[PDB]
Amino acid sequence: ASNFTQFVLVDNGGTGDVTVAPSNFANGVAEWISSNSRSQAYKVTCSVRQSSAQNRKYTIKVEVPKVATQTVGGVELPVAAWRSYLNMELTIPIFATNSDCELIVKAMQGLLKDGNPIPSAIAANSGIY
Amino acid sequence: ASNFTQFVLVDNGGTGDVTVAPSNFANGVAEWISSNSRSQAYKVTCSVRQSSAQNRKYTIKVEVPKVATQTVGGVELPVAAWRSYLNMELTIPIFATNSDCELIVKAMQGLLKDGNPIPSAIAANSGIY
Amino acid sequence: ASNFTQFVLVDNGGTGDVTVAPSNFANGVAEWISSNSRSQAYKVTCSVRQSSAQNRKYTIKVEVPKVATQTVGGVELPVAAWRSYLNMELTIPIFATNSDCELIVKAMQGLLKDGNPIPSAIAANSGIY
Amino acid sequence: ASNFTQFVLVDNGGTGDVTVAPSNFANGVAEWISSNSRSQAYKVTCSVRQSSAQNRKYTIKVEVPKVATQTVGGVELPVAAWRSYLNMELTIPIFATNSDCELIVKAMQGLLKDGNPIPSAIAANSGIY
Amino acid sequence: ASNFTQFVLVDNGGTGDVTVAPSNFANGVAEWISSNSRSQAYKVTCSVRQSSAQNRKYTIKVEVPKVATQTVGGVELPVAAWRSYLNMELTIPIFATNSDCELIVKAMQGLLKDGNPIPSAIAANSGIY
Amino acid sequence: ASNFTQFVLVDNGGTGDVTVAPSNFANGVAEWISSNSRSQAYKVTCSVRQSSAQNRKYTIKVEVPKVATQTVGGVELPVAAWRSYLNMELTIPIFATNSDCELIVKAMQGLLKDGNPIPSAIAANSGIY
């Protein structure tokens, strides 16, 4: 066990799956990037710090690039036309059991399950109503 | 559409599921709450605004009760020993089409799929190693 | 479910019932007015805010108009000769269960039930003695 | 008349009713209390004065105990975690006849009838949505 | 009950219809936006406020994009080549009953009815002649 | 050929219809006024001008009178008790073809179509909720 492993970030059903792999842990920040140039890569980072005396805080970030090829100076360079940024902070009391922590993980994945309100809004460029 | 409905936040497989239902919409912030006192409820909120000239941000917040040794309906203090707080900000460029937003949603749910490192670190009360 | 619905404010037994309907929610204040001109309408507003860290506070207001027709500049305008103002604030601890909250609602309606002391005093232009 | 009598504040239909009885009249403020310690009692007070040259105000206050997980007769601290406070001010113009005051009472009890939005938001621990 | 919902802004047949869906209601400004890239989206907003003691004033705004692709340096972005901007202010005295408001609405839709002088001048890049 | 003609501003059935007929076209402002006393008349004006190098801007204005009789000193005059004032500005870039103008017109009439949120909020003295 070492949980610092590769995983598939975007499952496009076997074909065109975006999978991300361990790439750095300098300064206590675990980083995973996809197999692209650093200019076009998906990136995921994660770090935990004991924020208060009684809390721990996980900070997770995801960058999703829209790839493009730009001509700069008559030369074509692999580029990301824009990136989208997910940025999440989770603060957990030190008194939380592993069963308590599993509840948090289940709530977070239920939140984004296909068909529930929030994933639907995002995917439609809509708000909730 | 009409996104604002009840949904299952924690799926404990049929029995013991936690459903969260619409409870407030003041200021266009959709709130969903579970059937509990506000001090012990699972609570979810979501809102969207154009954050900059080039971006929109979804702000999503979740609060999850510490359940081990909970006294249902009891007055449990300090509040911070008994609650976890999730805070997600998703910044999406105004150029993103719906297909782009679909992919962002898939990246978000891939991050948290069971077995992948971030959910299993959280659930095991751990960092990355 | 959306609890923002129309309701009858004054039940004059089917005939001359004053009924009030959703009319605004700007700034998180739910407003209902009766079907009159805005100068002669009954108005009801309601808003909830988390006042303290451990409290929530509901602020409910009702305006009851005494309608009249006034001649201003030789022209007759629909007007309210005076309005009566009910103004109530309810502060509930976050530790209150839904069964605890039902008790509050039952106490508030018992307070104003026909024949109990306070409704009798108001209706008679009397104090309590 | 003689308004100042006992009445049923919470009608749980015969069995489990909460009756509140006259308990103080210092300064012409009628107080009614239930049969409990003053820290756990249902308490009601009511007074009336001419607030301005044109108006009278009834000030009515209710305190309701948090009952889930209550220890009867116990010392429960903090007081604020265990109590809800209602505060109503009714301003009625000096022109209002008794019929007018009857209607104001009906508006007040319509606001709180079961099924109408404000009582059902409160009881469900919710805002308007 | 809610009027903050999705609706058809352009019935352009029953297929190329443009629909606008609720997006944000911050600060008393209801905003609706069509789907896909916000950069090419139609936008409608509406807000009502008591402009004077006697008047309420609605401000309604609509933006109609000309859809296009910007290509700069080989990078293509979905953009609006330009937008037409409708902006309208409707002032209504508080003495208007609901029937007077219906008439104001019929005047507005008569003004723009198909075949009448103003809609057909606009539709033809033309003035009055 | 002429579009400066009489037209129906309110089809209020096929009988109480309000028709507005050309009155004056001085200084590039087309004005139409309904018949009988100018004091109780509906008024519509429209003017188009090149607001910028790239834009033409239509200004359309409508006034809806509440008909009434002023009686002062025993002398009665037909007056408008008050007027609602619609004022709209539509900016269209010179690149719009006639088809783009038709679409702008369909957006305008969709906005005010019967049953959609803005016309029905106005019609009911209401905001968005």
Long-range contacts of C125-129 (CB under 8 A, 24+ apart): C125/D96, C125/D98, C125/D101, C126/D1, C126/D3, C127/D3, C127/D28, C127/D47, C127/D48, C128/D3, C128/D4, C128/D30, C128/D46, C128/D47, C129/D1, C129/D2, C129/D3, C129/D4, C129/D30
Nearest CA in chain F to E106: F10
φ and ψ at D7, to 5 degrees?
-155, 165
Give yes or no for A70 touching E (CB within 8 A). Answer: yes
Whole-number Å distance between alpha carbons of A64 and A80: 9
Contact (CB<8Å) D129/B73: no
Contact (CB<8Å) A9/B110: yes
8 Å CB contact between F89 and F55: no
Give the burial class of B96: count Cβ atoms within 10 A of its Cβ; 0-12 exposed, 13-18 middle, 19 or more buried: buried
Domains held by chain D: number: 1
Whole-number Å distance between alpha carbons of E60 and E43: 11
Contacts across the C-E interface (CB distance below 8 Å): 40
- CA-to-CA separations, E101 to E50, E94, E97, in angstroms, rounded: 16, 11, 6
Chain centroid, CA F28 distance in Å:
17
Contact (CB<8Å) E37/B2: no
Q: What is the CATH number of the domain that holds F77?
A: 3.30.380.10
Number of Cβ atoms within 10 Å of the Cβ of E40: 22
State the resolution, in angstroms. 39.0
Q: Which of B3, B7, B117 sits opposite A5 (nearest CB)?
A: B117
Long-range contacts of A50-57 (CB under 8 A, 24+ apart): A50/A94, A51/A91, A52/B80, A54/A93, A54/A94, A54/A95, A54/B80, A54/B81, A55/A91, A55/A92, A55/A93, A55/A94, A55/B80, A56/A91, A56/A92, A56/A94, A57/A89, A57/A90, A57/A91, A57/A92
Contact (CB<8Å) C124/D12: no
Whole-number Å distance between alpha carbons of F25 and F7: 16
- CA-to-CA separations, F42 to D64, E50, E89, F70, in angstroms, rounded: 59, 24, 17, 18
Show residues of chain B in contact with D126, CB under 8 Å: 23-24, 33
- Nearest CA to D72 out of D34, D44, D45 is that of D34
Number of Cβ atoms within 10 Å of the Cβ of A70: 16
Give yes or no for C27 touching B (CB within 8 A). Answer: yes
- CA-to-CA separations, E95 to D70, F52, F118, in angstroms, rounded: 53, 40, 20
φ and ψ at E29, to 5 degrees?
-115, 110
D112 φ/ψ sector (left φ>0, alpha ψ -120 to 50, else beta): alpha
Rg of chain D, C-alpha, whole Å: 17
Show residues of chain A in contact with B81, CB under 8 Å: 54, 93, 95
DSSP characters for B46-63? EEEEE-SSSEEEEEEEEE
DSSP characters for B77-98? SSGGGSEEEEEEEEEEETT--H
Give yes or no for B27 touching C (CB within 8 A). Answer: yes
Give yes or no for B102 touching A (CB within 8 A). Answer: yes
Whole-number Å distance between alpha carbons of E8 and E18: 6
Q: What is the largest CA-CA distance in chain A?
A: 59
Domain that holds residue B106: 1-129
